[PDB]
Amino acid sequence: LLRPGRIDRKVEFSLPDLEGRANIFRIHSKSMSVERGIRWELISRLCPNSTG
Amino acid sequence: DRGVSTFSPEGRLFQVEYSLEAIKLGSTAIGIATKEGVVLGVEKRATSPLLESDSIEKIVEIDRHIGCAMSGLTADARSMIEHARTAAVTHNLYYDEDINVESLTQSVCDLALRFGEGASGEERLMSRPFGVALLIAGHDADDGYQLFHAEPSGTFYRYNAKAIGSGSEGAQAELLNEWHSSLTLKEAELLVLKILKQVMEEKLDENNAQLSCITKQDGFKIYDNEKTAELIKELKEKEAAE
Amino acid sequence: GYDRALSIFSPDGHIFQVEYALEAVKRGTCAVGVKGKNCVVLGCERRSTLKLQDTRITPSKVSKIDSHVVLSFSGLNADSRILIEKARVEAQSHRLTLEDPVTVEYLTRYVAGVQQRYTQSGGVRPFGVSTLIAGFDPRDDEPKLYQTEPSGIYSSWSAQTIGRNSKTVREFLEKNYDRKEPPATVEECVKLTVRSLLEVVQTGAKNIEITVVKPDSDIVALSSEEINQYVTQIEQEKQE
Amino acid sequence: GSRRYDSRTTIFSPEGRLYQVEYALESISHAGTAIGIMASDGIVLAAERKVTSTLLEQDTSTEKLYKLNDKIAVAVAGLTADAEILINTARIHAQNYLKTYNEDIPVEILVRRLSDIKQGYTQHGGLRPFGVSFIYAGYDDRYGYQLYTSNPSGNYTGWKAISVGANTSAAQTLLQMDYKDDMKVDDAIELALKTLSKTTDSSALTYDRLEFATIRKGANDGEVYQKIFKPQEIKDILVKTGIT
Amino acid sequence: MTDRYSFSLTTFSPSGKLGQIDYALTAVKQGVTSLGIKATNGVVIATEKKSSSPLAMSETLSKVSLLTPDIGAVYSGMGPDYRVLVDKSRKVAHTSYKRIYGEYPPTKLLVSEVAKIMQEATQSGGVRPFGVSLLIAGHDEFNGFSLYQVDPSGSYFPWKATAIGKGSVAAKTFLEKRWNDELELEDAIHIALLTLKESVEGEFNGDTIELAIIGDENPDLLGYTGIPTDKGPRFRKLTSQEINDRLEAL
Amino acid sequence: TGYDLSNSVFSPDGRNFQVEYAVKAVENGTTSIGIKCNDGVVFAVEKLITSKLLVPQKNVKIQVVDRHIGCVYSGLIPDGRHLVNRGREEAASFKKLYKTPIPIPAFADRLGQYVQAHTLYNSVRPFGVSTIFGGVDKNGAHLYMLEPSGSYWGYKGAATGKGRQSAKAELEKLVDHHPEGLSAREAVKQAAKIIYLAHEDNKEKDFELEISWCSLSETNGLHKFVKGDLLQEAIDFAQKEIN
Amino acid sequence: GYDRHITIFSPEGRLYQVEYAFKATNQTNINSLAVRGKDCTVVISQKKVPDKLLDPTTVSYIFCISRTIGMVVNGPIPDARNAALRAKAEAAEFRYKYGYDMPCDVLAKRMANLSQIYTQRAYMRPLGVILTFVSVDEELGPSIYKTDPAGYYVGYKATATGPKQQEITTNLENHFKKSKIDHINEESWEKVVEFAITHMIDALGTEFSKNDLEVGVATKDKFFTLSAENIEERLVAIAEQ
Amino acid sequence: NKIETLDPALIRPGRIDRKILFENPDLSTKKKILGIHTSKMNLSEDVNLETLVTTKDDLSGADIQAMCTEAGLLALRERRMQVTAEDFKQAKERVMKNKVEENLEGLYL
Amino acid sequence: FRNNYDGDTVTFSPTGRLFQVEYALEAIKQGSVTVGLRSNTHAVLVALKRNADELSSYQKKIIKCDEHMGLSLAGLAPDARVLSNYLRQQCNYSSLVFNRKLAVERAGHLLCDKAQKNTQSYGGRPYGVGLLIIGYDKSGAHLLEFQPSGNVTELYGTAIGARSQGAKTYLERTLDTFIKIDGNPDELIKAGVEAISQSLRDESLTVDNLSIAIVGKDTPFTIYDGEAVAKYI
């Protein structure tokens, strides 16, 4: 299957940088009521690289 | 073993790649330099009310007109600071002259560089370049006020504004816009504290922030408690309009 | 002899050795310091359980480094012996060259520089040893209580716990001492140190040493009858 | 060739307990038993030989109890080769201190320095550490009799009774029940020989598999006298106690 | 240019007891047979010394070597290790010995010096242990005749009788019975040759069998009889004829 | 398996396998020839012109030792330069002691010890180069080759590099046809021929011919490069021969 | 595993480096024969047929150690040069200190000590050559000593080295035991040469020519090779006979 | 015991949400657990609840189960007709002794 | 990849390659691009100064050894600092004793010996840096290319760093043009401006980033930047 023809693109998805993981945290957090003024980037900073 | 000798596939030194992560854990330090004064403001780490916050230091005098901030492995950075102190005194003897911040920056990188592998032109007694980065600031006529950021790489860059430690990435993003040529000492001071609360996990206090400056008038001078408090108090009044 | 690299940084930006060193400290049996504004009070557990061990000639953890500088530890018992000798020579080297006994502040940096040299050299493993350093600065009566890490970092602390089960002991010091005003007298302060140690020791009066060091090189040791006196008070609190 | 290969014994262990030192205690317990019993008026010191071969002239050759000087005798358990180097080092150290200060070295000082050498080996020596425990039976006027033992770790601990070598627990347990604080040297002689026989698998522990020494201040005109007891003198006191 | 080793290759086995000490010992056992009987008026040391190739000179091959004119020694194990260890032992004894005493070393003393050197080989990184066992047979005033056995472990003990090499087990037992408290010099040699025949049978020419005694004193051998109160060489290396003679009186 | 890896440990056949690895570089390197002639020795080396960025006559591998020994080498280029330095060190030291030029036999003997020394070290790698060296001295013309493994012999003719196969097959027939040898002058033309047969092998890039010589009669037992009219005729005439 | 690979004592106690070294000699395929004359020591050896690249007259096996000692080396060609240094250098050493050159027995003792040392360090390995020192000592008269990579050594009445040493031994065994002579009792050294060549041709089965030869004769206070003219003159007598 | 005994695969993390790490009983915990056990042993009421806690070495509630069993085991050997204050106290020493014996002395250096 | 041999410097693969050198060639391409060209009477270096970010100031890449000699760094930056201090001392010594300036050929040769030495034995990294050494001496203008391996080679133009092929394309066409230009600084510099625009793809010059230096017959070592380089553009 790996041989060419069959598979024309191969792409590695990896755990993103701090700015993207701020964005993934951002979407979920918005949906919930929170005390506003929240620094999304603060919460992501502490977390090492991590899954969605 | 993975020595200093043996490189990564790209060709980088191992220790240079690892040291980036070491610094990241370190204490956040924020430097904005202007031609009206270098302002160094740092986060003091605290784990207890029982820790005594007077004793600890993260801004360290290296010379009469030289201030420094340290991040990385602290215990390795304590030696680094002792030798830097030696270098400065030794120059002062030879030329009867206050070392340029820039030369001092180079003299320190030459001393981190020296391993343990076993050379044939050099003295070995370490194992690696230190995996600590330092912000070396100071004043001299030629360049005016300066702020340097030394890497474990054996590379020095001069900066207008540089943030290292935990908050490296988010502080830098603001510092590009907000830093200007127009800024003076009172301007600079307020800005540093503002960035510092966003990247500080807990609240901002005058008892977990330590400010200093290098001015040419005073040399290296650590601000008392009272000034620090007052600039915090002044920043509050503006935040409550919102 | 050995000189090959062991200061090889992890890819998680740490010396491996330094991690292992931290692990070791814990195991050493607890030592506690709480300074008053008129004393430093030192408590520690010693081995004395074993019938047919003569305590007079079994070495005591608490160590004279100078008449007014004392040192206690948690960690490798082998490596401490080396440590204590190093401090003793330095202490005397100050009186020889700069004159006057070590300032406490100066001995704290000396002790720290030994650990640091072990991390600069790849050859030499850091000691797995933390120490409590306490004393009176020259010409002065101010109590200093210092703390070390085996990694080569030092700091001053109002109260401290190192060694076995720091958790229970830490939680007690956060409620029983407050930083705004230190214990007023020697007697009030001895009682708190005693109360804290018995938490993880469980009773005894024979096994535990309490050593009070007061200004002007006064080191005096509490009799077992005096230790129990404090226990007798505390039994009444626990009952009510 | 030499770069590739490693036999580093100078790794800081992750358990806080260096693995090489662990194995040297195993090796100690293969070697015969040596017992230090401290009494107010002396140290009664006795160690069984571990050879038992008949062709071998055990009689002549002391191999465990070595007299360093007048007040200090050492019993060996562990590796006999490693041990020889430390005997010469311990002998020269007591002489040098005696020369400088004109006082027999306090016991404390001597034991500490020797322990610190063992320590040094794993500190950054690169050396495998000596796999020997020594009971240093010592006297000095100030502190009375003093009894200390060493470890391959380079740690010493004082005691009023100690055992090393084989049957550490079996010997220690008997001494705890039978020895009382106040028993004198006189009792301890009788006590030592009998507990050893009972630990060992031998039906009677012969005089020729024994080494016996005492350090006592009950030698007249305020003096200190040691005597490594000769194999036949061990035999008479062996008969009294009924082992034979 | 020194090997980049900086540490002891020798490690404790995880069950105790050095790997390398065990490794060195096997060689002594594998190597050819030697026996010795300590006696009251001498010491007999005996070894097999088979032709390497008939064309090879079988006279220049030696396994007896001198340490002092009074003390001789024989080994089993690695041949090249022995030669060097002897040379070191001449210096360790003689010079240093003369400076602190100015005599020939007594046997007890000489044997102890050798023990430390074996230990230092092993301990030292980059240098693997000497795997040879030597029997040092000698005379001193204060202990009469003495026989010590020196193990490659750096340990020594004196023995009434001992054997090392392949045939050691058989030999020791044979001897054990024959050994007496009072022994004739003549009988010690008869008994020695009798056992040696059983180690490997045939080749009993006194050429291929190397025999020495630490016999009685000679101002004759000394080469000055002008004062004959001086001790002569105690050590004597026997001729082939002498051995031939012993076979008839056995 | 493991004996191979460990530098300076007997392979189970015999002799460290790294010494064999080093030989392989020398084959991959450029042609170098050394010809013993009546008068003296004639060296030629193939200098590839990869590009015209390269400076004509100026990427010489020809390095004088003392003043009467040419040295030229094939294989790993840095390794040569270290062994080249070593020859220099050795020549001077002889003149300290004995106040006169080193003989060529003595040079061949003393250079060879240096290779062996590093290859009974595990810590210091093999040399990756065969060196052709020689000159004319008081004791006459002499030609030696130091193999990568360290062996010195007299040679009528010597060759190393990729095109030694071509070089060898000619030199055997040239000696068969001329057992009385040939003058160094004629051999300037004949060196040029030999190199042309070897550039069949190294046909990928163009080349530049460089001869040097040390001759008894004509360079007066000093070593100097061949250039101008001597070199030109050698090019011109050889060309015709090989067509 | 590991123990075996590098120098250190294997579990068995075997030194694998040494075993391999003995194979190494045979790989050069050189064969030697040495006999004892009455007053000379004749050693003769093969040399592989010359290349047109090489010079056929060059030799590199023979090395004049001192006036007394000549040496012929069988084994690795590169290591033979290495070994040749140490023999001459220690030969000269003895002249300064003790005032004269080493005997044959005494030079062997010294090389053997050196060999042993080379084996213990990792970095150092035993010289893979087998060395054949020839001499006429005064005290021992005609002498041959064979010194091994191990550091092992012993004198010989007559010796052989190489893959086909097996054939030579059997010939010399026949030669010297039946007669019952420890060495050749023929006085003229020329007839010892005549005769050692004769035994070589017989034993390996292949005739020798000037080019394979190479004749070493050591005498009292001299080591010499025979001139090429003389090599050819011995051939005329050998064929008639 | 752990999720590392299983091949890990527990799907949807937030679908298994919070995970609970059991610490072992501490000093205060084992008072209460003790109180149940001592009510079964006849006449052990005499020995104050608190002082029972103090005199023993810090141990888990499981080891109280071992100790309570030890009291009855000793009462059976003695043919102690009714469980006493003396049994409960004796019980502490033998139970603590078992646990130390079972441990292997590897020597803290 | 790791594999092969590179923790061990001595040991090589069957082919004979040492992996350490391969990595060191890659290292060049990661860092600064610099181009050189020379006429018979002048020697030119054109270096693109670079930084980490905007607030960072730009940082020299030509480090002046002497009034008569220079070098430019492109692979490892700590390595270059070492060699330059070293080379400063060697020019002093040679000028002091022999009264003769350290000529560019020897200087590359002394330098090879130092790098080679660290790679010969255990201990010591290969110097990964590629240096382009210019110098003006009695025998006119030289440009040498210091390989990480320890090989020097005389060239007339060369380009180093990633995508160096573009620059070389230009220089070979105008090889003849460039050499026959002599006595002209302006002319030379103008060509070298164009050489480096071939290399750069999806990347911008800036005049302050562009740093150009000459050394020649009438000119000592001089560095020109800003308004100065605006002239040659």
Side-chain angles (χ1 to χ4, degrees), chain C residues 2 17 20 23 27 51-53 56-58 78 81-82 125-127, chain D residues 10-12 14-15 119 122-124 143 148 156-158 160 176:
Chain C
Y2 188 80
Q17 295 286 80
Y20 295 150
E23 293 168 349
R27 295 185 185 100
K51 178 187 178 185
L52 304 182
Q53 180 178 204
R56 187 178 53 84
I57 66 169
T58 282
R81 293 186 185 289
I82 294 168
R125 70 181 78 210
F127 309 181
Chain D
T10 70
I11 51 154
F12 191 106
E15 269 83 19
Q119 291 172 0
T122 62
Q123 192 45 230
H124 52 274
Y143 315 118
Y148 306 114
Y156 60 94
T157 299
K160 192 173 161 53
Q176 269 173 343

Short mmCIF file of all heavy atoms in Angstrom, two decimals, chain C residues 2 17 20 23 27 51-53 56-58 78 81-82 125-127, chain D residues 10-12 14-15 119 122-124 143 148 156-158 160 176:
data_model
loop_
_atom_site.label_atom_id
_atom_site.label_comp_id
_atom_site.label_asym_id
_atom_site.label_seq_id
_atom_site.Cartn_x
_atom_site.Cartn_y
_atom_site.Cartn_z
N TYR C 2 38.38 10.33 38.05
CA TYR C 2 37.35 10.33 37.12
C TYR C 2 37.13 11.79 36.73
O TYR C 2 37.34 12.70 37.55
CB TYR C 2 36.10 9.69 37.71
CG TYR C 2 35.01 9.50 36.70
CD1 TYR C 2 35.02 8.44 35.81
CD2 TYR C 2 34.00 10.41 36.67
CE1 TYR C 2 33.99 8.32 34.90
CE2 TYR C 2 32.98 10.30 35.76
CZ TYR C 2 32.97 9.25 34.87
OH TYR C 2 31.95 9.13 33.96
N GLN C 17 22.01 13.70 37.31
CA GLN C 17 22.59 13.57 38.59
C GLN C 17 21.91 14.34 39.70
O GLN C 17 21.85 13.83 40.84
CB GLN C 17 24.06 14.03 38.59
CG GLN C 17 25.03 13.23 37.75
CD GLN C 17 25.41 11.88 38.33
OE1 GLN C 17 24.69 10.88 38.24
NE2 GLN C 17 26.59 11.85 38.95
N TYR C 20 18.66 12.88 40.90
CA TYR C 20 18.87 11.76 41.78
C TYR C 20 19.25 12.22 43.16
O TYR C 20 19.01 11.54 44.13
CB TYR C 20 19.95 10.89 41.23
CG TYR C 20 19.60 10.25 39.94
CD1 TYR C 20 20.59 9.95 39.03
CD2 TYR C 20 18.29 9.95 39.68
CE1 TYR C 20 20.26 9.34 37.84
CE2 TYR C 20 17.95 9.34 38.50
CZ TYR C 20 18.94 9.04 37.58
OH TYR C 20 18.60 8.41 36.40
N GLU C 23 16.20 13.14 45.19
CA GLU C 23 15.61 11.95 45.70
C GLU C 23 16.20 11.46 47.01
O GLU C 23 15.53 11.00 47.94
CB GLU C 23 15.76 10.86 44.64
CG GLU C 23 14.95 11.12 43.38
CD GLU C 23 15.33 10.20 42.26
OE1 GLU C 23 16.33 9.54 42.40
OE2 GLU C 23 14.64 10.17 41.27
N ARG C 27 15.04 10.90 52.22
CA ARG C 27 15.25 9.74 52.96
C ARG C 27 15.92 9.94 54.28
O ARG C 27 15.48 9.31 55.20
CB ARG C 27 16.06 8.77 52.13
CG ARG C 27 15.34 8.28 50.88
CD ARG C 27 16.10 7.24 50.14
NE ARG C 27 15.43 6.88 48.90
CZ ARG C 27 15.76 7.35 47.68
NH1 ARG C 27 16.78 8.16 47.57
NH2 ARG C 27 15.08 7.00 46.61
N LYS C 51 18.94 -0.99 71.36
CA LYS C 51 19.59 -1.37 72.64
C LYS C 51 20.97 -1.81 72.28
O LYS C 51 21.19 -2.60 71.35
CB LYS C 51 18.91 -2.56 73.33
CG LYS C 51 19.60 -2.98 74.63
CD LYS C 51 19.03 -4.26 75.23
CE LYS C 51 19.79 -4.63 76.50
NZ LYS C 51 19.36 -5.94 77.06
N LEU C 52 22.01 -1.34 73.05
CA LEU C 52 23.41 -1.59 72.89
C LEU C 52 23.95 -0.75 71.79
O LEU C 52 24.68 -1.22 70.93
CB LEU C 52 23.89 -3.08 72.68
CG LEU C 52 23.46 -4.06 73.78
CD1 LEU C 52 24.00 -5.45 73.56
CD2 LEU C 52 23.82 -3.49 75.20
N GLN C 53 23.59 0.58 71.82
CA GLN C 53 24.26 1.68 71.15
C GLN C 53 24.27 2.70 72.20
O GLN C 53 23.31 3.08 72.83
CB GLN C 53 23.53 2.15 69.83
CG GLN C 53 24.29 3.33 69.15
CD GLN C 53 23.58 3.73 67.83
OE1 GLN C 53 24.21 4.30 66.92
NE2 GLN C 53 22.26 3.55 67.73
N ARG C 56 26.68 8.50 73.68
CA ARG C 56 27.75 9.43 74.00
C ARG C 56 28.75 9.33 72.89
O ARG C 56 29.11 10.36 72.31
CB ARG C 56 28.36 9.12 75.33
CG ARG C 56 29.41 10.21 75.81
CD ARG C 56 30.05 9.97 77.22
NE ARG C 56 30.67 8.57 77.34
CZ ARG C 56 31.97 8.31 76.88
NH1 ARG C 56 32.91 9.25 76.52
NH2 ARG C 56 32.33 6.99 76.78
N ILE C 57 29.14 8.11 72.46
CA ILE C 57 30.15 7.99 71.43
C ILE C 57 29.57 7.69 70.05
O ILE C 57 30.33 7.56 69.10
CB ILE C 57 31.13 6.84 71.75
CG1 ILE C 57 30.37 5.51 71.71
CG2 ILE C 57 31.75 7.05 73.12
CD1 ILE C 57 31.27 4.31 71.76
N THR C 58 28.18 7.63 69.93
CA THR C 58 27.60 7.58 68.57
C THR C 58 27.55 9.04 68.07
O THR C 58 26.94 9.84 68.77
CB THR C 58 26.23 6.94 68.56
OG1 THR C 58 26.46 5.59 68.63
CG2 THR C 58 25.42 7.31 67.27
N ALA C 78 27.51 9.46 54.89
CA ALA C 78 28.88 9.34 54.43
C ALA C 78 29.37 10.68 53.95
O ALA C 78 30.41 11.20 54.39
CB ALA C 78 28.96 8.34 53.27
N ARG C 81 30.13 13.88 56.30
CA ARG C 81 31.38 13.96 57.04
C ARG C 81 32.47 14.76 56.32
O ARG C 81 33.22 15.49 57.02
CB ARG C 81 31.90 12.57 57.27
CG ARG C 81 31.03 11.76 58.20
CD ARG C 81 31.64 10.46 58.53
NE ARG C 81 30.73 9.65 59.32
CZ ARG C 81 30.42 9.91 60.60
NH1 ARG C 81 30.90 10.99 61.18
NH2 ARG C 81 29.64 9.10 61.29
N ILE C 82 32.57 14.61 55.03
CA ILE C 82 33.44 15.25 54.13
C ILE C 82 33.05 16.72 54.24
O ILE C 82 33.88 17.63 54.18
CB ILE C 82 33.22 14.88 52.68
CG1 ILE C 82 33.52 13.45 52.39
CG2 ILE C 82 34.14 15.76 51.87
CD1 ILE C 82 33.05 13.01 51.02
N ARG C 125 30.29 13.47 41.48
CA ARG C 125 28.82 13.45 41.62
C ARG C 125 28.48 14.52 42.65
O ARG C 125 29.30 14.48 43.59
CB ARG C 125 28.35 12.09 42.10
CG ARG C 125 28.75 11.81 43.55
CD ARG C 125 28.32 10.47 44.03
NE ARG C 125 29.16 9.38 43.56
CZ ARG C 125 28.72 8.12 43.35
NH1 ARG C 125 27.45 7.83 43.52
NH2 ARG C 125 29.56 7.18 42.98
N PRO C 126 27.41 15.39 42.54
CA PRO C 126 27.00 16.14 43.68
C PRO C 126 26.73 15.17 44.83
O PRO C 126 26.17 14.13 44.62
CB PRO C 126 25.73 16.80 43.11
CG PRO C 126 26.01 16.88 41.61
CD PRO C 126 26.80 15.63 41.26
N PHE C 127 27.11 15.59 46.04
CA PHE C 127 26.54 15.09 47.34
C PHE C 127 25.08 15.24 47.20
O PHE C 127 24.59 16.24 46.56
CB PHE C 127 27.03 15.89 48.63
CG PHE C 127 28.54 16.05 48.76
CD1 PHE C 127 28.76 16.76 49.94
CD2 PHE C 127 29.59 15.46 48.10
CE1 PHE C 127 30.09 16.79 50.44
CE2 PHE C 127 30.88 15.47 48.60
CZ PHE C 127 31.17 16.22 49.75
N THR D 10 30.82 5.56 39.08
CA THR D 10 30.80 6.88 39.67
C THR D 10 29.52 7.59 39.25
O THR D 10 29.25 8.77 39.59
CB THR D 10 32.02 7.73 39.31
OG1 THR D 10 32.05 8.15 37.95
CG2 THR D 10 33.40 7.02 39.62
N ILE D 11 28.56 6.83 38.69
CA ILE D 11 27.16 7.21 38.57
C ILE D 11 26.54 7.42 39.95
O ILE D 11 26.70 6.59 40.83
CB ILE D 11 26.25 6.26 37.82
CG1 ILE D 11 26.33 4.77 38.29
CG2 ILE D 11 26.62 6.33 36.33
CD1 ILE D 11 25.07 3.95 38.04
N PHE D 12 25.77 8.54 40.12
CA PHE D 12 25.00 8.89 41.29
C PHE D 12 23.79 8.02 41.09
O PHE D 12 23.07 8.13 40.08
CB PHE D 12 24.57 10.39 41.39
CG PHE D 12 24.01 10.78 42.72
CD1 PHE D 12 24.65 11.54 43.68
CD2 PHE D 12 22.69 10.30 43.06
CE1 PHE D 12 24.06 11.72 44.96
CE2 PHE D 12 22.10 10.50 44.29
CZ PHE D 12 22.80 11.24 45.24
N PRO D 14 20.09 6.21 41.33
CA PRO D 14 18.72 6.70 41.40
C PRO D 14 17.93 6.23 42.64
O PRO D 14 16.77 6.61 42.82
CB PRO D 14 18.01 6.08 40.20
CG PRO D 14 19.09 5.76 39.17
CD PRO D 14 20.22 5.37 40.09
N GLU D 15 18.53 5.35 43.44
CA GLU D 15 17.83 4.86 44.58
C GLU D 15 18.43 5.59 45.72
O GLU D 15 18.02 5.32 46.81
CB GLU D 15 18.07 3.35 44.64
CG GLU D 15 17.00 2.49 43.89
CD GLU D 15 17.31 2.40 42.38
OE1 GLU D 15 18.44 2.65 41.98
OE2 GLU D 15 16.36 1.96 41.64
N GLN D 119 35.13 6.54 51.08
CA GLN D 119 34.18 7.45 50.54
C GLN D 119 34.66 8.07 49.24
O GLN D 119 33.93 8.14 48.23
CB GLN D 119 33.92 8.65 51.43
CG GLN D 119 33.22 8.46 52.72
CD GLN D 119 33.27 9.73 53.48
OE1 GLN D 119 33.84 10.68 52.95
NE2 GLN D 119 32.75 9.78 54.69
N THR D 122 34.44 6.56 45.44
CA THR D 122 33.16 6.56 44.70
C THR D 122 32.71 8.01 44.58
O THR D 122 31.87 8.36 43.72
CB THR D 122 32.11 5.75 45.45
OG1 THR D 122 31.87 6.37 46.73
CG2 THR D 122 32.60 4.34 45.67
N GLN D 123 33.40 8.91 45.32
CA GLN D 123 33.07 10.29 45.23
C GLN D 123 33.45 10.83 43.89
O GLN D 123 32.64 11.36 43.14
CB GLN D 123 33.85 11.13 46.41
CG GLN D 123 33.33 12.59 46.58
CD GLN D 123 31.79 12.66 46.56
OE1 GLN D 123 31.18 13.44 45.85
NE2 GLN D 123 31.13 11.91 47.55
N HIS D 124 34.73 10.55 43.53
CA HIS D 124 35.24 10.82 42.20
C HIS D 124 36.52 10.09 41.91
O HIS D 124 37.21 10.43 40.93
CB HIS D 124 35.55 12.36 41.94
CG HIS D 124 36.40 12.97 42.96
ND1 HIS D 124 35.92 13.50 44.14
CD2 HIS D 124 37.77 12.87 43.14
CE1 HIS D 124 37.02 13.77 44.94
NE2 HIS D 124 38.15 13.44 44.33
N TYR D 143 37.91 9.73 76.77
CA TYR D 143 36.61 9.27 76.42
C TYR D 143 36.42 7.86 76.86
O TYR D 143 35.37 7.27 76.58
CB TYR D 143 36.35 9.52 74.90
CG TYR D 143 36.79 10.91 74.45
CD1 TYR D 143 37.78 11.11 73.49
CD2 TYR D 143 36.12 12.11 74.97
CE1 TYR D 143 38.13 12.42 72.98
CE2 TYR D 143 36.50 13.35 74.50
CZ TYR D 143 37.47 13.54 73.47
OH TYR D 143 37.69 14.85 72.91
N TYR D 148 34.04 1.61 67.39
CA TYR D 148 33.42 2.08 66.15
C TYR D 148 33.74 1.00 65.14
O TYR D 148 34.68 0.28 65.24
CB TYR D 148 34.05 3.40 65.58
CG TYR D 148 34.14 4.65 66.46
CD1 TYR D 148 35.37 5.18 66.86
CD2 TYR D 148 32.97 5.33 66.83
CE1 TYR D 148 35.49 6.32 67.63
CE2 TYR D 148 33.08 6.57 67.47
CZ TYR D 148 34.31 7.02 67.90
OH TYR D 148 34.23 8.24 68.67
N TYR D 156 30.80 5.42 59.63
CA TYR D 156 31.16 4.75 60.86
C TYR D 156 30.01 5.11 61.80
O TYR D 156 29.34 6.13 61.63
CB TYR D 156 32.55 5.15 61.40
CG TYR D 156 32.70 6.53 61.70
CD1 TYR D 156 32.50 7.10 63.01
CD2 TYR D 156 33.14 7.39 60.65
CE1 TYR D 156 32.84 8.42 63.24
CE2 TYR D 156 33.51 8.72 60.94
CZ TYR D 156 33.35 9.22 62.24
OH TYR D 156 33.64 10.62 62.48
N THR D 157 29.82 4.27 62.82
CA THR D 157 28.71 4.46 63.74
C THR D 157 29.32 3.87 65.02
O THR D 157 29.93 2.79 64.98
CB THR D 157 27.40 3.71 63.38
OG1 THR D 157 26.97 4.23 62.10
CG2 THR D 157 26.32 4.06 64.41
N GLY D 158 29.04 4.53 66.19
CA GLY D 158 29.52 3.99 67.46
C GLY D 158 28.55 3.00 67.97
O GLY D 158 27.42 2.92 67.51
N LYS D 160 27.73 0.00 71.53
CA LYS D 160 28.14 -0.67 72.74
C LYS D 160 28.29 -2.14 72.45
O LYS D 160 28.95 -2.90 73.18
CB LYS D 160 27.11 -0.33 73.77
CG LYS D 160 27.47 -0.69 75.17
CD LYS D 160 26.44 -0.14 76.16
CE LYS D 160 26.50 -0.84 77.53
NZ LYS D 160 27.84 -0.85 78.12
N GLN D 176 22.07 -9.28 72.96
CA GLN D 176 21.08 -8.37 73.44
C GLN D 176 20.38 -9.01 74.64
O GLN D 176 20.08 -8.40 75.66
CB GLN D 176 19.99 -8.10 72.40
CG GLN D 176 20.35 -6.84 71.48
CD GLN D 176 19.34 -6.67 70.32
OE1 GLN D 176 18.59 -7.61 69.99
NE2 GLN D 176 19.27 -5.45 69.69
#
